[PDB]
Design a protein around this nucleic acid. Structure first.
Ligand code: NA
Ligand code: NA
Length: 317
DNA sequence: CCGACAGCGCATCAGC
DNA sequence: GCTGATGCGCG
DNA sequence: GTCGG
């Protein structure tokens, strides 16, 4: 059902970037994915209506699509110079719905206009403009692996008590990723507790020219650009995030940023039946009254599986 | 019917 | 200068 | 836009 999900995704993107209606966005998105997993060529709006996340208005749009091959509303959207321009601009990192809108109002509409108007771009936006094409590219797995070995080894060289894990679709074993997401921790950093834990690692990664640009950086989160070394033809630049997490919240962190999103959802749901609440930071027990107690000591991803009485599940699954 | 729908780190800005 | 609000990405 | 209380 690629026609229906593409229609929907377009609707989702139009709501997010142009309408600035984040909930309609997520609703269209939820609907698409749900329809992705449906093992039959949808024949009617009503049919899809049965799905969770598919309601009356979408079932109606599905009928119109099936019947006419197109969606009238989507058509008019694409024909509207302002909507399409705003929609395109948001593809630049650091340009969200607010900036895109403001740019199209003053006649700034294209990549070329941005380059002509770099005087009006913040640092994040310039970098986003700069690597516009590379950021939309997928990172094939074998490159992730290469990138991993470098981060882990450079982190190893700074301080070897540093623990680092590359999460995301990658840890679940995907053949490609959109960026690199790295969780870092250290015995000296805890809920209760150093000045430059993240810095030394960010810095050390600049020393060997792996990290090439900085979008943001602070005591706990770094957002930036990296690139693999080449012999021969050069690699695309990639987005990399690095999170510094306290050691007593690291595995909850690892569990969270490993996903999937749908999976986490089921874990939390299950965790409830058993009398535990799980967030990005901690697992805590619930009193009979629904009152969370203190966070429980987690020394591994499995500890969490143990608490909520679940068969430990390997990231791939 | 009507509110909820993730909300957090960092960069930047408005308002003092 | 200082504090809190907002935009953004991420998810 | 869809859900659920
Ligand atoms: Na139904
Ligand atoms: Na973007």
């Amino acid at each position: 059902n690629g026609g229906i999900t593409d229609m929907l995704t377009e609707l989702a993107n139009f709501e997010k970037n142009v309408s600035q209606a984040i909930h309609k966005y997520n609703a269209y998105r939820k609907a698409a994915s749900v329809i992705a997993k449906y093992p039959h060529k949808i024949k009617s709006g009503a049919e899809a209506k049965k799905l969770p996340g598919v309601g009356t208005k979408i079932a109606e749009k599905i009928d119109e699509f099936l019947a006419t091959g197109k969606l009238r509303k989507l058509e008019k959207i694409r024909q509207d110079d302002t909507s399409s321009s705003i929609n395109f601009l948001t593809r630049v990192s650091g340009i969200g719905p607010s900036a895109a809108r403001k740019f199209v109002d003053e006649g700034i509409k294209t990549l070329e206009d941005l380059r002509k108007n770099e005087d009006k771009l913040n640092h994040h936006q310039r970098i986003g403009l700069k690597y516009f094409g590379d950021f939309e590219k997928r990172i094939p797995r074998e490159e992730m692996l290469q990138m991993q070995d470098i981060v882990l080894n450079e982190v190893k060289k700074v301080d070897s008590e540093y623990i680092a894990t590359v999460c995301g679709s990658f840890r679940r074993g995907a053949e490609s990723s959109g960026d690199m997401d790295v969780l870092l921790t250290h015995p000296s950093f805890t809920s209760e507790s150093q000045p430059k834990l993240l810095h030394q690692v960010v810095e050390q990664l600049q020393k060997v020219h792996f990290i090439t640009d900085t979008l943001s950086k602070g005591e706990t989160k770094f957002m930036g650009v990296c690139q693999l070394p080449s012999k021969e033809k050069e690699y695309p630049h990639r987005r990399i995030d690095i999170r510094l997490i306290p050691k007593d919240q690291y595995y909850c962190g690892v569990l969270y940023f490993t996903g999937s999103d749908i999976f986490n959802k089921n874990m939390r749901a299950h965790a409830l039946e058993k009398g535990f609440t799980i967030n990005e930071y901690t697992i805590r027990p619930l009193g009979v009254t629904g009152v969370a107690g203190e966070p429980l000591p987690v020394d591994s991803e499995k500890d969490i599986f143990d608490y909520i009485q679940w068969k430990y599940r390997e990231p791939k699954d």
